[PDB]
Amino acid sequence: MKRTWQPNRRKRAKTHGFRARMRTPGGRKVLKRRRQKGRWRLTPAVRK
Amino acid sequence: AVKKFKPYTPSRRFMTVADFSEITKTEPEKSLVKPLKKTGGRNNQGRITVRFRGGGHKRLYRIIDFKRWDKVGIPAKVAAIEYDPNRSARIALLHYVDGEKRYIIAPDGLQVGQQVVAGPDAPIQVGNALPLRFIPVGTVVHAVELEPKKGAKLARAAGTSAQIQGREGDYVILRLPSGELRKVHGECYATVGAVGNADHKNIVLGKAGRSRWLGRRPHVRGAAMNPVDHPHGGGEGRAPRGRPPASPWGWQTKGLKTRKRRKPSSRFIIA
RNA sequence: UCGAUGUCGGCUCGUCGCAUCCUGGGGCUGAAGAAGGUCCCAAGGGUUGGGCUGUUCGCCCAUUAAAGCGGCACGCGAGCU
RNA sequence: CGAAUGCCGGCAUGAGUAACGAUAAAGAGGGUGAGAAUCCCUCUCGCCGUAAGCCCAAGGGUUCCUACGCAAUGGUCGUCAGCGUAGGGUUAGGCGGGACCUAAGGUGAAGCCGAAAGGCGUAGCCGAAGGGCAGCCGGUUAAUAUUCCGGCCCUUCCCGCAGGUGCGAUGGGGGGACGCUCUAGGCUAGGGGGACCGGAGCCAUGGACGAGCCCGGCCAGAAGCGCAGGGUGGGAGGUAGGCAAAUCCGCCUCCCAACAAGCUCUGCGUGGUGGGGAAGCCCGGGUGACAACCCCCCGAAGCCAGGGAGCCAAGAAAAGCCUCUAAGCACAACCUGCGGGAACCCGUACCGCAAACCGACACAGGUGGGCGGGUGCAAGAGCACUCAGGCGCGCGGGAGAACCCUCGCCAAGGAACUCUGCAAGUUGGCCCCGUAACUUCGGGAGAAGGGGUGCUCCCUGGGGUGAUGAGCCCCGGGGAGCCGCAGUGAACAGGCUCUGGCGACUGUUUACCAAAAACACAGCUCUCUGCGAACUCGUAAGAGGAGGUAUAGGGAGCGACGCUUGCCCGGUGCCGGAAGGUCAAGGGGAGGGGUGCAAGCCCCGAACCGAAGCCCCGGUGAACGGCGGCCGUAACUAUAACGGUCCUAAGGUAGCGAAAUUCCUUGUCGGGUAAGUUCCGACCUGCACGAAAAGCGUAACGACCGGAGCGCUGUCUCGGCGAGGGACCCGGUGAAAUUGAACUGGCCGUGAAGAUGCGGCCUACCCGUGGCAGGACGAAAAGACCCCGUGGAGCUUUACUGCAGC
RNA sequence: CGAGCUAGCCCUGGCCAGGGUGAAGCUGGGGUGAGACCCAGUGGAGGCCCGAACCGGUGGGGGAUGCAAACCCCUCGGAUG
RNA sequence: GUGGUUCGUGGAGCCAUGGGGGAAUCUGGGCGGACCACCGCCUAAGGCUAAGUACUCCGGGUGACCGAUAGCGCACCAGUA
RNA sequence: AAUGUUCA
RNA sequence: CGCGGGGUGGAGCAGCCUGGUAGCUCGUCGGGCUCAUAACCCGAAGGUCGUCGGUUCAAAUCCGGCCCCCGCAACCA
RNA sequence: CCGAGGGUAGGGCCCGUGACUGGGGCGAAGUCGUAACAAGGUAGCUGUACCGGAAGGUGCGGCUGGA
RNA sequence: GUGGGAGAGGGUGGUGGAAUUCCCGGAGUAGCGGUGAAAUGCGCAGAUACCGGGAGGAACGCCGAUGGCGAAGGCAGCCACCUGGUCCACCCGUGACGCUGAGGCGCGAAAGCGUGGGGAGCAAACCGGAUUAGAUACCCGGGUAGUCCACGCCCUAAACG
């Protein structure tokens, strides 16, 4: 039956995007924490 | 009159609708910078702040003239009497001799063809606006202004009206639709006559939907909810409030006066 | 027995106890006969179909030689409902 | 370290067991190869066919094509593959996006607010399956194509040039521009026939050389040309409006003219011409060919489109586009021609109802748009069969036990089954007869109960298209006649009625145990709210309410409609009371105290004046709410209209009543039944109905709950036979919970009170397989209930204490 | 950190085979002093009816280390709101 | 009103503040724990100022520190799969 | 300021 | 079995709590008005205060053992 | 073909009966009050509306068969 | 037909003042009110009484009659408009056209009912205070529907001469 994950490229970008993460101070902290832990992908890698 | 229907389907053996003859001679709006895209929306900045609104037929907004001292003395012919989705009252499309067209909340009696004008000089007859000071004590008027130059705000609902009770200083005493006795400045305009389309208070919605077409979604009762949702909610198997009747926010809802006490607005009221 | 022993009734499958409801013997009788009553020995085998109720239990209807009582975790839910 | 349902890892047990994932289905012959049920080819066979076939979006990212390969992945096999290695492969001025437009919303110069972070927010900017915009028919590749190529037809810009005109905005106006339901006339797509046109061929098996059988009879196409439509009055003067800048709009005024004309703009044929071109037969290609390429009929949901009619709930924006003038500039400049030139960026493979997307899986689940042929059935996208095209579901082979699942049938009976007709049967389409109470006059109605239904031949009426007439289709009407058990001969396809309860009705709900008498609902009443409304969100700014104004908006309860909705303001709440009582700061300082030699400086501090609140006074019930007891009494008895007395704020009215409410209770009568703890009707000592937490009713409605009947049945007496899929056997692959170790029997005792394991006695060769579930206090979950813990949460209030708010 | 599930609302698109019933209007006839009103005919209304797609999830059975952490078969409700 | 301090209203000063009233410039003005009086300390309502002090991403040196279930989560292509 | 047993 | 409420002239209710007094209404009795009855006027009688014990000097009254009475609660499974 | 009848199914009229229920007629001296007839001691009557053990009472209007 | 007359005949719109009640202002003080007598109730929160301003609803004094009008129910301030009947006179017109009226249709006080309005006084029900043996009544103090309008119903009567 109709499952939880229904992939939408634009939605993903607009939601968890780099720019998106940048606007909100909360997001800027995310980018901070991740960059500082060593993640290879700061943001959900998705190509268009 | 109101149109009634045979009982072919229930909910429609009780249903009734307006006599649209009054309108006629025009269904299409006077586009000419008369209607505007009108934004729907039962909430403000996210949260719903008025319950149960939403849905309801698409609607175009007709911009009407609620301050007529713009064209003092410039007379106009009454082009038509159209339908307005945004109100109980019907509007009248009136061409000015000027060439400029405007809309006015159609008073009762007004007819396509008649002439009309606003001003002090203006003759005391249906459709004409003038400062209350220049209106004969006793005459019925609608679309009254509250403070001068601030525009009309009283007696605009279908078939509503205010009557002049007499002057007294720079003010004139009006008995408002509600029935309250307020002193209103003499400079406040007001067009003569009643609001018109008084059969309105009589149309019987009929079915559960239709109340929907009017953008009103279902209103659920307090007791029906749970202790958390409302003060009335709770109690095993049907109960009687159990608290003095109250709103979901908790204030008493039967008889408790609410208007602000120290409001300067008083001093000019009496009813 | 609570780091769990599924609780009523029914259905299905029974088995046992016997303080015996039938059917076998028997002594009294206020036993003439045909009947019955009460006690004695004896379960080998029997111990119906419906109406009402979730009922067990009952109370009815129509029968019967009789339509017995009770134990088996008020037998039986890794058998069903 | 031996235990912590300990942690990590390894390996066991169950066990060669369950299972190998839709019961659409397979067989054989050839190949290939080390090896093939499983790969390739062929021939049979079966399944799908509004698809199980095509095309597009999303998401997926190479899976696409070719050559090699088989460890692992494909639940078996594998030579095969969506798998491994390698190499190819995606071409655009016109398709879709961007160098266009705006929606909700987002952002956000100004501007407002906020301890900071940050919140609103104007212009502007961003934002699209919506608006706007120029590409058709074929042909090619292993793999791309509206992209390359062919033919035909367009779009922008730039230059030169000839010929035109007051040219010219981010400004003005027009326009773009809009609903739902119902529809006319033409068309087109699509489809069906043809005695006509073209064709290789075929006469089988009893017959047929046949007006036979079989195959196929189109696509695109500028200008012009027709045929359908859509748009549209022309004039001439004034003008207080278009934040007047206009000869453009808009307003008045007046010659003419109008179910039109002309002018415009589409659609459709037609068109120079280009293109395609079966079946069959011979190896995707050839041949079929210089293939013919015509005529009727049906005909859209599509086109003409901004067509028309009706209705109430009254149906986006902006740009392009016309037009108007502003500065300006008139050498500019726009406009039309005509040739030359210029024409960027991104996507394009493949999957795409699924083995490539979301579900850990090559998962019987989920996933938006378009096409979706033919015959038959009243119609249809339904059902049955079938084209094209695609499949036979990634373990097989036998055996024909119980038992289970899905399915067919049954003597006689026909609900006796059972909590309950649960389930299954019966009925089923269409045409015609013909239908009751009751009702809100619509309905109840498909009431019920019946008859007809196939094919053959004859006569006969209307229509549409033609042309009036033949063909071709569309509706019919009447006679005779034939055959079967049976004619909607298969598939789709109501069982019916009577009487209660609840809610009026359609509708909503606990995604995954409740679809209901619950919620909602039209409608009734109460109450608040005069607009910077009340109310809601927010510290605020600000916003919703509402570009609304009590015929409006918020809160509450009841819940269509009908007839109605009584008494009690004692307490509680709310509304009203400029008096008094009390009351905090603050004002006021009689009076008193600490110090100084003092002037002083400090402290207390009474009268009295001091809000709201509470007190007090009064109102108020569709406001929280409440709405009695005990004695006696009639000329038989019974009973009590009547009387006494106590208490109250007042003592329950109409109506209903052993009820969704009645404990005693299966109350008592009556009805139904052979029998009725249920049901219906009555009664009324109502444990404990009762009037908007509404009372009593009500036609219609209901996958709601109860009681009866008729019909009909394996539900049952009572079980029997048969079918397919498992189970069983062989070959291939091969799990799981659980598990202290086991060499694991019965009885009567015993024991922590329910023993394979102690005692006694009694049976008992060792080991499996197919079955059944009594025990192993079997498994699974550190019992939900229960109690306990000075454990936790959610909820309430006249619990305490705070805070928001007022 | 989340409204790529679910709930509500906002903007913009799409979709709903085929049957049945036959309201209001109109049109003609009848009626009357004029009306009301009554007939036929046309017309095509409705949180109307049947029933696919589509949206559900009523009863039963199957399933329960599943095909599936809610599925399957029969049955059933809506289907211009 | 509050905050700070050991100071939780306490006899509660001092040092800070939101609100109200509101001076003086050395005969000025604050403090020495209510308040007075003496005695004594100090000069508010402007600003700057090394060093001693804190930490360890980084380089080095040591260790009665670990030795691949340890030691950082990573000794290995780990903030990866 | 209620009332007034029956048949004559 | 539990909680606590009521027992008084003939009727229905007081009085108990802060023991010394039984009070009200009704009726029953006699006497009046009437013609007579009712209403009314006048004036009286009437109570082991459910019962059986010890507290007191004294018990309707304080205390306990029953006896009819009246209510309320009886649950979780 | 018709056809007496027979069956099945739904209607219409009438008679009998029915727990129970509503009011009526009738039966020498039961119970409660006293509405009407004399201002019947609240003029009566009446249609209609609510209420009440009962006759009745009151509202609104009409009557004179009252003043 | 012509020419005159009288009338609260009917409908619609407008309007007048007295009066009752309430609101505001002013003044003023211990009672008011009610009855058979009282009480409930109203009033020291400033009532009654009197003055001034205002809202509002209903009804029409004097004229007024023993009167007029209509078919009946019924109809009373004044204005206008719309309109029904009726009488007199002239002797002109038509030329028996007449009368009644089963059924039908129209009207039809009051009460009552629906939808919306309106609400001063009055006032069923209803609550109080008395009066009474009782008093579900007469009396008194309050009070709702109703009375009032518009529209649609109801169609009865001592609709009586």
Ligand SMILES: NC[C@@H]1O[C@H](O[C@H]2[C@@H](O)[C@H](O[C@@H]3[C@@H](O)[C@H](N)C[C@H](N)[C@H]3O[C@H]3O[C@H](CO)[C@@H](O)[C@H](O)[C@H]3N)O[C@@H]2CO)[C@H](N)[C@@H](O)[C@@H]1O
């Ligand atoms: N009278 C017959 C009708 O019914 C009622 O009348 C009935 C009663 O009123 C009347 O009862 C009366 C009673 O009123 C009066 N006060 C006392 C009297 N003893 C009774 O009498 C009654 O009962 C007795 C037996 O006891 C019988 O013998 C006698 O016939 C009978 N009428 O008896 C009548 C029965 O017939 C109406 N009031 C009357 O108007 C009506 O016409």
Ligand SMILES: [Mg+2]
């Ligand atoms: Mg935001």
Ligand SMILES: [Mg+2]
């Ligand atoms: Mg609701």
Ligand SMILES: [Mg+2]
């Ligand atoms: Mg919540």
Ligand SMILES: [Mg+2]
């Ligand atoms: Mg709460």
Ligand SMILES: [Mg+2]
């Ligand atoms: Mg309850």
Ligand SMILES: [Mg+2]
């Ligand atoms: Mg236990």
Ligand SMILES: [Mg+2]
């Ligand atoms: Mg255990």
Ligand SMILES: [Mg+2]
């Ligand atoms: Mg037994």
Ligand SMILES: [Mg+2]
């Ligand atoms: Mg024995």
Ligand SMILES: [Mg+2]
């Ligand atoms: Mg079980």
Ligand SMILES: [Mg+2]
């Ligand atoms: Mg099991």
Ligand SMILES: [Mg+2]
């Ligand atoms: Mg274990």
Ligand SMILES: [Mg+2]
């Ligand atoms: Mg392990």
Ligand SMILES: [Mg+2]
């Ligand atoms: Mg197997």
Ligand SMILES: [Mg+2]
């Ligand atoms: Mg097939």
